[PDB]
Amino acid sequence: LVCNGDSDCDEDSADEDRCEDSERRPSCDIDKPPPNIELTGNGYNELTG
Amino acid sequence: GGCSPHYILNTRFRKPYNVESYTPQTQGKYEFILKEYESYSDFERNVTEK
Ligand SMILES: *[C@@H]1O[C@H](CO)[C@@H](O[C@@H]2O[C@H](CO)[C@@H](O)[C@H](O)[C@H]2NC(C)=O)[C@H](O)[C@H]1NC(C)=O
């Protein structure tokens, strides 16, 4: 995954530090996630709803 | 670093390192209460002696 051109380290993007744009592959055409997918990531408190 | 893709609508944002999430959890609560009260009271007399 290093130098995918995708930040596969979550918060750090350390897999993309000092990475040459000649080595970065065009991993995908686009990077727009579905319009609110991040909410699926969230946790839920079943008592308080 | 960071530079994960975060979008709101078509606008893409760079999140601060400090921030865990900033996400558009939209919601709206309206509340309308109208209370009208009327009272009237009328009192008359007419009295005559001859
Ligand atoms: C006291 O007397 C007056 C005068 O008659 C009364 O008022 C009149 O009432 C009649 C009938 O409803 C009307 O045709 C007149 O135009 C009224 N005139 C005036 C100046 O108000 C009144 O209603 C009487 N009140 C009581 C409690 O008996």
CA distance B22 to A3: 27
B42, B43, B46, best to mutate for ligand 1 pocket (most atoms within 8 Å of CB): B46
Q: Is the CB of B42 under 6 A from ligand 1?
A: no
CA distance B5 to B25: 18
Resolution value in angstroms = 3.3
CA distance A36 to B7: 8
Of A14, A32, A39, the CB nearest to B7: A32
Q: A18 vs chain B: nearest CA distance in angstroms?
A: 11
Reduced 3-state DSSP string for chain A: CCCCCCCCCCCCCHHHCCCCCCCCCCCCCCCCCCCCCHHHHCCCCCCCC
